[PDB]
């Protein structure tokens, strides 16, 4: 008899979780699964991302998430018309572009909170 | 056609990378995936989790993540002869008392780096 480990969840985390939230659901497509005042979680296919609220804006900024999918191209195209492929000259929200990273075939984005979350091609 | 999302992998944070796979593995059961030098993988059953090196000692301090468990009660009591149960007056890796909360029954556990993970019965 040994505990077996099921499933993770990422948690992002922001200055301002409500924003994020909003973000994440209104323009990436994610659904809201619960939303408490300081932390919040979201839902799209079969994951899950949890947001959780601090204080100091270096966390954000340090904060990673690695996201596996099938179809990246298209997610890819998905938000392109939502979110800024100009992943250097932009301050808010953006997208790298597609890439060969030794994890496989992926992207990164940045919310505006801060977050980096990497997208890889299963 | 839609893109699907298929999986997540939490990234904890650490000032020091090799110890904090030294810890998750020697101690808490998991293997290295793969180790470079400023991150690293670490799997047990279903989950990974990655390690990436910070600066800034608050990001780790602030950094959180869940994970789900068949036989909750077991991964307590093999984990509590390695970690410490005094989660308050101890200052290095520490375990508290399982608990029901919103998310479920569970317990939290802070690695030496100052990650704080959610362990929850599934």
Known sequence: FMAKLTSAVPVLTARDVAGAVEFWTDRLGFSRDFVEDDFAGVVRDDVTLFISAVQDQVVPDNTLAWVWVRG????????????????????????????EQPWGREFALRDPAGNCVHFVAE
Chains 1, 2 share one sequence.
């Open 72 to 99: 990246l191209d298209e997610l890819y195209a998905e938000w392109s018309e939502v979110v800024s492929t100009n992943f250097r000259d932009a301050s808010g929200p953006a997208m790298t572009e597609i890439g």
